[model samples]
Target: DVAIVKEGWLHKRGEYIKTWRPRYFLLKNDGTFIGYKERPQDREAPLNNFSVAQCQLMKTERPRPNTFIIRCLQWTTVIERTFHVETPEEREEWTTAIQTVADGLKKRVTMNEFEYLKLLGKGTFGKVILVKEKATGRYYAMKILKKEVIQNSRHPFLTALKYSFQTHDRLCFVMEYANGGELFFHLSRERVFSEDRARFYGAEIVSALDYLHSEKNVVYRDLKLENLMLDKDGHIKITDFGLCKEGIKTMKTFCGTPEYLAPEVLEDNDYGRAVDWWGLGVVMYEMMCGRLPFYNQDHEKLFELILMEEIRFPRTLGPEAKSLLSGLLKKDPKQRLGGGSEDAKEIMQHRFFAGIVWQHVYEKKLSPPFKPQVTSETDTRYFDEEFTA
Candidate 1:
């Protein structure tokens, strides 16, 4: 439902005359700002209106003490409107409200802009569809969620959620398409990745997690091969923010893939960002060993093993790899890698990633160890047949 952000009366300056008069103003969530000669009833047309999406607001010192300006750009021309509020507090409230609308509307999108191509995946509340933008012909993964279902750091290893929009009964998130498809798909076909390959992807994951945790104060609760995607260049792009918690210093939610669940999460204990490190250990182990560290056919046994049993590494596994996994898979959250004051820095400095240049990883300068085979940009060969078909 459309919501009203702010509505009141302000003294608006005349277009060409040196005059100011009271005008009823309204700001709505749909990115519309309107001013009327007097307070108008619902459905009544306003004398002047501006699309907040194309406007910027700022406090101006010339007109008066409590004066602000709204500049709406139309094509190449700038149309400026100045308003004088009763008090400095009113100016603050008005500017703050307009800024909120401006930020929210900056990249808001509509469903009509894209031509639906095919369904890429499905989930409990909605499905992800591949679509092409009509204006630029670029492909994207559009995730559609039902209204009932509840709801970005820009790291090269993390998928960029570029835009979003809401309808009466649904919410849609438009994201950059990772045409290389899911890492799970590739892993299923390859069975196991070489140690060097696993290390490359592992380092990338660490880079992404560092940005999420340290830079954004977010905890990616779900971290598995399934959520890791590969872009056209074969670089990793983490997706599916359904389980991520932002600005969280600590969390206690018992959620995420069973096999990848951290011991603290399984134990129903309050956990910080450390759970992601445990998930990284599980993912790394799976990448190299092609099996989970704590696996069982039953849920209870799987959780029990994760909580109590010691993880074993293959005899052929490298010493550095084993040491990193051991540190990450520590049962105690406090003892886990990346859980200290250093956070991801501690993990990044590990011997396993000794030669890694974090700057290169963040900039995606290092070549991907593996590139998925694909025919074209729209090729679905790398995706699951269940959804592609």
Candidate 2:
């Protein structure tokens, strides 16, 4: 099997211009070269991964002094791509890497693409595995769904299903591997998180919720630390959308973690995106405090507390943080912070996030107060060994 060779940034020529656009390029041992329109015009990143087998690579001179062209040959067509790197060393290194991949290209695609390694986690649906795609040499969390659960779903902040296939008894999803493990893991080890750390995670969650609610019109019914994964960079990635609903204004899903469930959800009322905001508040509460606000293992008692109990905060909470949590946990969805006219934007502007620049959050700026220790891209040390079977 081929492996991940090298990856770097190189300038590529865009159509209708003599300009050099910096694009992320990836070369795999399987002879596949990917060119990411990293800053594609007004669009999310686009992957132009193509095979270099039966291809021709030639350095060009017409457009600029330093330029190279790659012509990929398929069944009956020839596709060519051009790129330019700044220094001679950069150009030589990438050219040699691409040539190496081309020299190692196999005949065709294989069904056994991923080499299953360790078990990541399991759920009612199927199981999550830490698989290494032999071709790309990149690790991925492959979810083997026994049924057609996720028919067709795509969201950046969501599961980020890279590719999916089906078998007789299961469907599999290859997701970008998040090496930092679940948010619950870190929270469990630390007991409680600093306000800055909590804010960083909360901001990412907010971004996810807003994108799900507004852009995709998808309702993320499940929002808890266990369902939230962290990348090696300490960025948040929401996972396990088995209970998530889409294309519905109000969903009556009486499901979610006991402590994080919204009152209306527990009451079996039609709830919309407001439940997500409530879940967010519960997550925030858990981050601030060491435990859940209303903790009861009993079904009856927990339901009652969720319905009638007055939300309280620790003396450690400041005015802004307290206000934000209170507004999110409001009993009446109509009075909820995200339930207001401005929706998430209004909640984002609350005093708690007063100095937070939303742009920074989107750009993954605002350094995390605590960065989880991750050894490598495939490191599982941050995760519990119990789930590594």
Candidate 3:
């Protein structure tokens, strides 16, 4: 009986491109495994498969977090097939699936091990509370989801179930606690970001979206300043995959922030990954102007403006910058800058990215232009001081 053991969206690294593309993979109960590149569900044939046998999944942390490597006895060297998963839980899930019959291989991180510390943040699903690992005395942000309302199987994100357990009919998800706070916090303070600052962050997002779109065939519906988060070093990380669409070519989902929503998205047209490019355009424009082009406090007026308004560039914006914005903000998906055959490549090649070192960006080698003040890992000074919940 062949049945999908476990499956989710992840990026498969390409050595030549030095980029990550989305891939879907799952293990079968019959000691066999299968995977599909780009479109995991849509691919006609299994791109590749192998037996785990007595082999084990090796986890490592050097370049990044939650990296799992498997070296078969015959294989000469270990290489990254799926270089890195965004979430630790996901990384382990892949490993667990491979070692089907393996038992007690790794200790489960139970709820009791962590000491409830402080309230980090809150969301529609649950509270992001800070907790300290009793044994290690390390802090983490635990996201608590009500089982009935939020189901991981129904709506999966770029997240993995690391340390999770059920208590009081709630699923506690211990996720990576970002000390630097949301990107919106810093951007709101600065009002408008400088060219270098904007490009640096924009490039990082480009890489993120490229991976989501290229392989996973995902459409990140939300790409606003608020969703973009900064680590302690001010490096960008896009979070909140609740609204992301997976493996759907043309989706008719009417969801997303009003200002960042593309024309097609607002019009209820069948949209796909191209919508993210449009959202990026709005983000770039906001970065330059410090305000949304079609923003109004009123909802109906905002929609009216976004639907019918002309996306004009300020006199101060440079030619390259203007070109990139104009192309992305185009109402037509077919003509959108990043929607072309080369996809994200066209946007990256724009003159606005003239001196960008792609390798430096990929490796996070270049230092961020803006450095926020965060004394330690558990720092919450950069975050909001007040919340209703």
Per-residue lDDT over 334-362 for candidate 3, one digit per residue giving the tens place of the 0 to 100 score: 88888776778888899999889876787
Clashing pairs in 3: 22-215, 22-216, 90-160
Stronger candidate by lDDT (2 vs 3): 2
Candidate 2 lDDT over residue span 75-150, tens digit each: 1123356688877677778778877767765433233887888886665446778788887676777767555332
Superposed model 3: Cα runs more than 4 Å off: 1-107, 115-139, 149-168, 241-257, 384-389
Candidate 1 lDDT tens digits, 1-389: 46789999988765422257677887987776767666768512111225666576778778487889886533212346679987899899998898988898776468999999888666545678888888876778787776553313466787777787878887788887777877887787788999899988999999998887766555676788778988777888888534111111112222234677777655433456788999899999999998878878765677689878899999989999899999999998779988887889989999999988999988888988887676665666655466342
Candidates ranked, most accurate by lDDT first: 1, 2, 3
Worst 10 residues of 2 by lDDT: 243-252
TM-score of each: 0.65, 0.64, 0.62
Clashing pairs in 2: none
Highest-scoring model, TM-score? 1
Error of 1 at 199 (Å): 0.9
Off by over 4 Å in 2: 1-111, 118-125, 147-156, 241-257, 383-389
The window of 10 residues in a row where model 3 has the poorest summed lDDT is 243-252
> Judged by TM-score relative to the true structure, which candidate is superior, 1 or 2?
1
lDDT against true structure, model 3: 0.63
